[PDB]
Amino acid sequence: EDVAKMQEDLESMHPLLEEAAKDTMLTMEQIKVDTAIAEETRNSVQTEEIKANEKAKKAQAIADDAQKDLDEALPALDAALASLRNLNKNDVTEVRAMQRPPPGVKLVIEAVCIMKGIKPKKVPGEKPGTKVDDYWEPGKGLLQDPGHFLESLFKFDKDNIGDVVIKAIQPYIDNEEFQPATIAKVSKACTSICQWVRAMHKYHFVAKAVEPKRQALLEAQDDLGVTQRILDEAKQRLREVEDGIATMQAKYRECITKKEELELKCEQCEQRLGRAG
């Protein structure tokens, strides 16, 4: 009885030994295939890492060039805006009271009124009738409050400079008397106002030639972010395959220790076969 039994235990365990052996080999080749793919994803990741490093060098090259165009006008503005802080309450009050403003001051009070978008006052001209507009009287109101004047210059902030107001003041810029070095012989407050206007004019003109650049800088960052998401989706996979390998590396080891146990069991049932014979 016992002999037959043992004999079938050994026969039945033989297929279990053959089954564990395919499983360990199956495991084996599976680690080999994920290792090769984990490597393919590693070169794929290294090529995207150079792809996002160049797209950042290119995005920065656009920002430096676009920033170069912007300090083409930015120093004059702050210089001028310094000079507007140069002005105390009376410097406005003194120009406002001028009952006979020299032609330099008229020019400057004209220029500002247009920038700030003020309605002129058509007054007699020299040739009879010929109504010419005199911005003086509406300027006076913008100087009635010196505080409210200077703030509204500090709050202009460009952007809202219609293309109308820039051709309206192209004659003033093109004027060789609209130079602050000259206005400085007659009045101080108008020298500050003279360079302010002259400045926001070029600033309006460069800031329109950095619309293309700032948009290329916008599109260059968009490219880096897509290469960035493609990259990070790859490092996620490279991580996931590597943990898959790790999990299978420990399956292989359990596969092995299971074989050893079935082998050890096969040896014993074998050993008391040739014992009982």
DSSP-assigned beta bridge partners for residue 122: 133
Contact in structure between 120 and 135 (CB atoms under 8 Å): yes
Cα distances from 4 to residues 13, 18, 47, 268, in angstroms, run 14, 22, 66, 15
Q: Which residue has the tokens 């247009």?
A: 114
What is the chain's length?
277
**Who contacts 148 (Cβ-Cβ below 8 Å, separation ≥6)?**
none
Contact in structure between 201 and 169 (CB atoms under 8 Å): yes
Cα distances from 263 to residues 29, 171, 186, in angstroms, run 22, 103, 111
Q: How would you class 120 by CB atoms within 10 Å of its CB: exposed for 0-12, middle for 13-18, buried for 19 or more?
A: middle
Q: Which residue has the tokens 């026969």?
A: 11
Q: Within its chain, how far is the Cα of 41 from the centroid? A: 29
The beta-carbon contacts of 178-186 under 8 Å, at least 24 apart in sequence, are 178/107, 178/108, 178/111, 182/104, 183/104, 183/105, 183/107, 183/108, 185/104, 186/102, 186/104, 186/105
| SS3 state of residue 250 | helix
CB neighbours of residue 17 within 10 Å:
14
Nearest to residue 44, comparing CAs of 277, 227, 225?
Answer: 227
Contact in structure between 38 and 262 (CB atoms under 8 Å): no
Contact in structure between 137 and 120 (CB atoms under 8 Å): no
What is the SS3 assignment for 86-110?
A: CCCHHHHHHHHHCCCCCHHHHHHHH
**Where does the chain have alpha helices with state H?**
2-70, 74-85, 89-97, 103-115, 136-144, 146-154, 163-168, 170-173, 180-186, 189-209, 211-271
Nearest to residue 228, comparing CAs of 42, 43, 44, 51?
Answer: 51
Separation of alpha carbons 86 and 206, rounded Å: 26
Nearest to residue 196, comparing CAs of 85, 119, 92?
Answer: 85
CATH 3.40.50.10680 fits 14-264, yes or no: no
Nearest to residue 136, comparing CAs of 169, 110, 104?
Answer: 110
CB neighbours of residue 119 within 10 Å:
8
Task: Tell me phi and psi for residue 122, to 5 degrees.
Answer: -75, 120
Nearest to residue 30, comparing CAs of 250, 234, 239, 237?
Answer: 250
Q: Which residue has the tokens 């500090």?
A: 154
Separation of alpha carbons 114 and 162, rounded Å: 11
Taken in order 149, 154, 159, 165, the sign of the CA dihedral is positive
> Which two structure tokens, joined as six digits, stand for 182?
């000259």
Separation of alpha carbons 27 and 252, rounded Å: 6
Q: How would you class 139 by CB atoms within 10 Å of its CB: exposed for 0-12, middle for 13-18, buried for 19 or more?
A: buried
* Residue 132, H or E segment: strand 132-133
End-to-end CA distance of the chain: 14
> Which two structure tokens, joined as six digits, stand for 192?
């500050």
Contact in structure between 37 and 238 (CB atoms under 8 Å): no
- Experimental determination approach used: X-ray
Separation of alpha carbons 223 and 17, rounded Å: 56
Cα distances from 79 to residues 75, 188, 199, 258, in angstroms, run 6, 15, 9, 84
